[PDB]
């Protein structure tokens, strides 16, 4: 009467299309997801921004159905539909009542496999894309992260923005989008996954009915394999000063670990060691992180967050600081980098606490069916399998303090960094003084 977590099945449709389901018996809703392993990296210098334009144009009509025949096919039956794109994969997912999914699957297949892009549609969507680009500049986090990505892998396709240059937006034609469809939408590089109340057999039948005509790619590769030259991490700095901003956002990062690197969970554990903080948190004074205590006591900032973004053949590992005490920015940066460098001599209680926290937080962020479906899709897209919780527990258990020390010595100790600052950054010192704090001199 205790029940157990339901395992995820997996099957291939004689075409490379992998389907993964996590059946929920007593569920009233459901989610169906369709992802492709082709983000904004496959673009070139000419046809950049074609991925976002292509995603924007998906729900504007097909050969069979036109616009206002899709909304009336979705709004009538009560079925939400949404999509978004990333730097390495693009996704589509539609959730509806238990009884409405078997038609949402068909409509999604009709939208994906078959499509029709008209010059009028492009000339209509150009202004929408331009408005979106003009709006996106206001947000600090997106600007900071885009600048950090551009200044880290400069000269590489991984260093571009997903939206693309404003010049390219008003120059794309239908032929480039059709070429993108013909090239990067193949059965070997596609995936469907459901995490609701739809049975695995029913999903298999629907997939065979509405997807058994795709053509596998000529380059028969695996899932998530690198495609191109390995980008070179180039330490640099970007300062977009603006004296009217009350705050000052700063992001500092080093080279991280790829998805297939054998030191992934160690980097995650160290990220958990550093943790995150916020001045509005109820338990702010009582946090068990040295950085949190030193920041809170002197009120050096408003918040900070540690991230471990990872790609197929590279990644980033750093911190994102938001502060309002203009004048003590150098102290904040120095203390942050000092705590970064201190990980070479980390104790054994800190490692165990971080391991427990990471084990708890890894499988605690999946509550809605959409989140579970997205996690399944991403995990199958990048690596190629969805690791069972037993495997995750075993991999986390192997971590000891000496592995943390080795990784911190081979990655963080006196290594190049890539920074990016936005706002009132007059008090932020230059590059050499910033870098000098990442390696302690006492030892």
């Amino acid at each position: 009467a205790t029940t157990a977590l339901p395992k995820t099945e997996t099957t291939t449709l004689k075409n490379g299309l992998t389907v993964a389901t996590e059946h929920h018996p007593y569920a009233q809703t459901a989610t169906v997801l369709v992802g492709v392993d082709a983000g904004s990296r496959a673009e070139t210098a000419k046809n950049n921004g074609a991925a976002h334009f292509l995603e924007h144009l998906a729900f504007k009509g097909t050969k069979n159905r036109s616009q206002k025949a899709l909304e009336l096919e979705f709004e009538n039956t009560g079925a939400h539909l949404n999509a978004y794109t990333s730097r390495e994969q693009t996704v589509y997912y539609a959730h509806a009542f238990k009884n409405a999914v078997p038609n949402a699957v068909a409509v999604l297949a009709d939208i994906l496999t078959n499509s029709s892009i008209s010059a009028s549609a492009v000339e209509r969507e150009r202004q929408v894309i331009l408005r979106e680009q003009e709006e996106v500049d206001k947000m600090a986090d997106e600007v900071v992260f885009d600048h950090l990505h551009a200044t880290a892998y400069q000269g590489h396709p991984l260093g571009r923005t997903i939206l693309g240059p404003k010049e390219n937006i008003e120059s794309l034609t239908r032929e480039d989008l059709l070429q993108y469809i013909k090239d990067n939408y193949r059965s070997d590089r596609m995936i469907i996954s459901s995490a609701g109340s739809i049975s695995h057999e029913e999903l298999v039948k629907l997939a065979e009915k509405y997807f058994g005509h795709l053509e596998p790619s000529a380059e028969q590769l695996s899932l998530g394999a690198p495609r191109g030259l390995k980008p070179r991490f180039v330490g640099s700095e970007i300062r977009a000063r603006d004296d009217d901003s009350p705050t000052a956002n700063i992001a500092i990062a080093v080279e991280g670990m790829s998805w297939k690197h054998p030191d992934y969970f160690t980097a995650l554990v160290m990220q958990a060691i550093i943790g995150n903080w916020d001045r509005a948190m109820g338990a702010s004074p009582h946090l068990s992180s040295r950085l949190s205590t030193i920041v809170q006591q002197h009120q050096l900032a408003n918040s900070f967050m540690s991230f471990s973004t990872s790609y197929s053949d590279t990644g980033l590992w750093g911190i994102y600081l938001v502060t309002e005490n203009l004048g003590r920015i150098d102290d904040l940066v120095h203390f942050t980098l000092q705590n970064w460098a201190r990980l070479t001599v980390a104790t054994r209680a800190e490692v165990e606490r971080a391991k427990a926290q990471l084990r708890a937080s890894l499988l605690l962020s999946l509550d809605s069916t959409t989140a579970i479906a997205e996690d399944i899709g991403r995990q199958l897209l990048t690596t190629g399998r969805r690791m069972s919780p037993q495997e995750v527990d075993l991999r986390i258990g192997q971590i000891t303090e000496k592995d943390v020390a080795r990784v911190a010595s081979e990655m963080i100790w006196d290594k190049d960094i890539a920074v990016s600052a936005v706002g009132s950054i007059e008090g932020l010192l230059d590059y050499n003084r910033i870098r000098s704090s990442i390696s302690m001199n006492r030892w």
Binding site: A150, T151, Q154, G155, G159, P165, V234, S236
Partner: peptide, 11 residues
Amino acid sequence: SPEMPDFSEYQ
């Protein structure tokens, strides 16, 4: 916003 200036000469 412009593109990244070419730093390949000094690299």
